[PDB]
């Protein structure tokens, strides 16, 4: 009916892993590219959480640039992943901790093991960590709390903004809450960009107010940081549920971009 | 071409049957007409 990409497993399959996959028939899969080949090294957010230097902004940008897919079936060592198409009504699964209400706008984020770790079928240095499939404004607010952790986290040396980060620290939504990781170099460069915007906003337009190569250097170092910080905001919501299956295992949705 | 003889000094044109290159103008004409999905359903599903 649709485009369908196959996964071959290098691993000798565990029957318990096949049983967990047959539980997760309705799941959603992070994939780099819609070449019809997929290896286990390619499949999964294993390919995101492998460089422990790296952090949440590049996690989100990798999940933007990499293909969002729906689990369909498993056939021995091969895995059938039907790539969704904008406008059709698909059964997907809630792997994230956040519960789902009907009609809700549904949005991909990478999962965070800060207090809410949830492993998977992992064997031989590869996990199938599925992205948190989380509401839209909640996803934006997760990223806003992350960037303010990376901003306010330098002033841990003072009790006041130490208490402000510990006061932030926490994102609470409907009936399902989660903690949030501390950043004390992705989020560091993100807030380098934010701090250049913040510094130069009081520095570059003051003689433009009175009318409305140095300036090109300054506004270049402004605007490329502006582009790199804007690119990680627009959440590109993947799904939009028509009805939620009760006990929040699954939800029939329509797929967006 | 019909030409005509003479005996004066004017040369009548040697070119019998002058070539003409004409072409076919094309113009498509389109009419839209609508049928409601209600009308299609009263053709298709067709109750008691």
């Amino acid at each position: 009916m649709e485009t369908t990409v196959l996964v071959t497993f290098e691993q000798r399959l565990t029957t318990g892993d096949v049983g967990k996959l047959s539980r997760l028939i309705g799941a959603v899969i992070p994939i780099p590219y819609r070449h019809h080949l997929l290896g286990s090294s390619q499949v999964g957010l294993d390919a995101v959480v492998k460089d422990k230097t790296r952090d949440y902004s590049r996690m989100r940008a990798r999940m933007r640039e990499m293909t969002l897919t729906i689990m369909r079936r498993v056939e021995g060592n091969q895995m059938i992943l039907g790539v969704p198409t904008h406008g059709q009504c698909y059964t997907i699964r809630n792997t994230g901790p956040v519960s789902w209400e009907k009609g809700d706008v549904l949005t991909t984020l990478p999962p965070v093991f800060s207090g809410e770790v949830t492993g998977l079928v992992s064997v031989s240095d590869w996990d199938l960590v599925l992205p948190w499939i989380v509401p839209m404004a909640l996803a934006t607010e997760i990223n806003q709390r992350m960037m303010m952790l990376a901003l306010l986290s330098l002033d841990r040396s003072h009790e006041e903004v130490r208490a402000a980060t510990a006061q932030l620290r926490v994102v609470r939504y409907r009936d399902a809450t989660l903690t949030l990781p501390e950043i004390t170099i992705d989020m560091r460069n993100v807030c380098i960009s934010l701090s250049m915007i913040a510094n130069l906003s009081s520095e570059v337009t003051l003689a433009y107010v009175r009318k409305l190569t140095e300036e090109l250097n300054k506004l270049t170092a402004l605007f490329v940081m502006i582009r790199q910080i804007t690119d990680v905001i627009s959440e590109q919501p993947a799904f939009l549920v028509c009805d939620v299956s009760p006990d929040d295992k699954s939800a029939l949705c329509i797929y967006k971009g | 071409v019909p030409r005509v003889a003479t005996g004066a000094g004017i040369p009548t044109s040697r070119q019998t049957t002058v070539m003409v290159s004409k072409y076919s103008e094309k113009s498509p004409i389109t009419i839209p007409f609508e049928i409601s999905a209600a009308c299609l359903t009263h053709l298709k599903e067709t109750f008691e």
Binding site: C89, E101, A137, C242, D243 | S36, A37
Partner: protein, 249 residues
């Protein structure tokens, strides 16, 4: 081919709509923990938008602002409006004269009565609709929903909203033609934006696609129910496409 979804609507929110189908319905996880998950009429957010003048605002508040002034407008009027809290999903199908109102709201397509006999128009009320129109239109005018505040006192002062209908599809040209007539809002918006040194406000406006409609059969009109008349605008073959919440300032 259209996707519809049965929704819990309170039987004290099923009105209007139930008299004459066609409304927008927004959802929201609001502040009181016992009734947090609520779906919302377009006439019900009209009594939150300031652009509806206070007579018409309290007219539909006399229709069902009993529920509004129960808890809900104390969460929307009283507890200050965010564009985050409300999300548009489309136009109602399945009138549902049942025990508990289960209204099957559409997602994308032309909102229809089943059996293809009646097409559901979108009833956009008058004061939230008209004033951001562009030019004279031909067959595929697009609907955008825009919430636009104006900074007065309480770091935001007053909430207000619009339903802009325009042929202009593009995001940045659409926000520039908003910036044409919203010079006043960005005056006092700049004023309390430079008032907040450490405290904050939250910006001006938020745009999103809602769909398109037949727009040459577009006309205004009126409904009437309990608490009287209500002058509205009737958008006939309203295709639904809820776009992204795109903010401007």
């Amino acid at each position: 081919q259209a996707i519809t979804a049965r929704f819990f609507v309170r039987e004290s929110l099923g009105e209007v709509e139930q008299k004459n189908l066609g409304v927008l319905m927004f959802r929201l996880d609001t502040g009181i923990e016992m009734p947090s998950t609520v779906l919302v009429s377009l006439f019900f957010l009209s009594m939150v938008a300031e652009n509806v003048s206070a007579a018409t605002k309290n007219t539909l508040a006399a229709i069902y602002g009993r529920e509004g002034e129960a808890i809900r407008t104390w969460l929307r009027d009283g507890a200050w409006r965010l564009h985050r809290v409300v999300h548009p999903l489309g136009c109602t199908n399945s009138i549902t004269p049942g025990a508990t109102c289960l209204i099957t709201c559409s997602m994308r397509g032309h909102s229809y009565n089943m059996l293809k006999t009646e097409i559901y128009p979108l009833l956009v009320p008058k004061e939230i609709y008209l004033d951001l129109d562009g030019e004279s239109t031909d067959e595929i005018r697009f609907v955008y929903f825009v919430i636009t505040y104006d900074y007065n006192s309480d770091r935001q002062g007053r909430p207000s909203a619009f339903v802009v209908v325009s042929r202009i599809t593009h995001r940045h040209t659409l926000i520039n033609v908003l910036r044409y007539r919203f010079r006043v809002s960005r005056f006092h918006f700049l004023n309390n934006s430079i008032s907040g040194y450490g405290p904050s406000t939250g910006c001006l406006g938020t745009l999103q696609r809602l769909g398109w409609f037949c727009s040459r059969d577009s006309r205004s009109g009126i409904v009437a129910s309990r608490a009287g008349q209500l002058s509205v605008v009737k958008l006939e073959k309203f295709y639904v496409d809820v776009g992204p919440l795109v903010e401007f300032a």
